[PDB]
Amino acid sequence: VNSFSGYLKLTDNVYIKNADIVEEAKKVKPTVVVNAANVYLKHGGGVAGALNKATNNAMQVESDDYIATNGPLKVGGSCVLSGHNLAKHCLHVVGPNVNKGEDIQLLKSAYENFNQHEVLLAPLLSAGIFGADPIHSLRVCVDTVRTNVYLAVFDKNLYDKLVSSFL
Ligand SMILES: O=C(OCCN1CCOC1=O)c1ncnc2[nH]ccc12
């Protein structure tokens, strides 16, 4: 038993709620919050900008040191950094951004990173400003992640659409 509240169960291991991941993180303080990162860990907008803002830019400062030491991530890849005031850890995961022209097949590889963590609070990868179909992102999540994932979907109308179309 964990501390997540009001999630709709979708599968054995996937749960979903209409909420801002930032607000869910501040309330729950999960072991792992997933960031919808880019390969440069430049946290400007959407999930990344919102989480980073909630850390008072400490996420960005830590990220810049990570990139200076290690270079960029791969599309489909991830790294574990601090969760700052929001979580114990932040798993920065790079889903493909089709608005930038990347391969959607890499979305499954991106979700595979979640399997290295027993429980995660996460957003819908490659959706929103990343340009991919959200119904598809949810399907890939359910068909790829085997650990316990609590999905926060910020957009009320998107949430309604995802629940009503879920197979
Ligand atoms: O951007 C997010 O996810 C992608 C799908 N979208 C687009 C806008 O609304 C959505 O749900 C998202 N999710 C959960 N918490 C969030 N806090 C800020 C952004 C955000």
**CATH label of the domain that carries residue 94:** 3.40.220.10
Strand bridging mode 8-9 / 14-18: antiparallel
Whole-number Å distance, alpha carbon 20 to ligand 1 midpoint, is 7
Cα–Cα separations (whole angstroms), residue 76 to 110, 157, 159: 4, 27, 24
Resolution number, Å: 1.0
Q: Residues 130, 122: contact at Cβ < 8 Å?
A: no
Burial class of residue 44 (count of CB atoms within 10 Å of its CB; 0-12, 13-18, 19+): exposed
Residue ranges making up the domain that contains 28: 8-163
Q: Residues 150, 4: contact at Cβ < 8 Å?
A: yes
The closest residue, in CA terms, to atom 9 on ligand 1 is 155
3 assigned to some structural domain: no
Instruction: Give the closest residue to 77 by CA, choosing from 63, 96, 64.
Output: 96
Q: Residues 7, 16: contact at Cβ < 8 Å?
A: yes
Method used for this model?
X-ray
- The identity of residue 162, as a single letter, is L
* DSSP collapsed to 3 states, the chain: CCCCCCCEECCCCEEEEECCHHHHHHHHCCCEEEEECCCCCCCCCHHHHHHHHHCCCHHHHHHHHHHHHHCCCCCCCEEEEECCCCCCEEEEECCCCCCCCCCCCHHHHHHHHHHHCCEEEECCCCCHHHCCCHHHHHHHHHHHCCCEEEEEECCHHHHHHHHHHCC
1 assigned to some structural domain: no
35 assigned to some structural domain: yes
CA gap 17, 51 in Å, rounded:
18
Is residue 8 within 6 Å of ligand 1 at its C-beta?
Answer: no
Cα–Cα separations (whole angstroms), residue 103 to 70, 128, 156: 23, 16, 28
Is residue 112 within 6 Å of ligand 1 at its C-beta?
Answer: no
124 assigned to some structural domain: yes
Q: Which atom of ligand 1 is nearest to the CA of 24?
A: 15
CA atoms within 13 A on the CB side of 106: 17
Q: Residues 116, 22: contact at Cβ < 8 Å?
A: no
Residues 6+ apart with CB under 8 A from 1: none
78 assigned to some structural domain: yes
CA gap 165, 62 in Å, rounded:
39
What total of structural domains would you count in the chain? 1
Whole-number Å distance, alpha carbon 88 to ligand 1 midpoint, is 21
Backbone angles phi, psi at 82, to 5 degrees: -65, 150
Whole-number Å distance, alpha carbon 152 to ligand 1 midpoint, is 8
Q: Residues 110, 76: contact at Cβ < 8 Å?
A: yes
Is residue 154 within 6 Å of ligand 1 at its C-beta?
Answer: yes
Q: Residues 25, 56: contact at Cβ < 8 Å?
A: no
Is residue 46 within 6 Å of ligand 1 at its C-beta?
Answer: yes
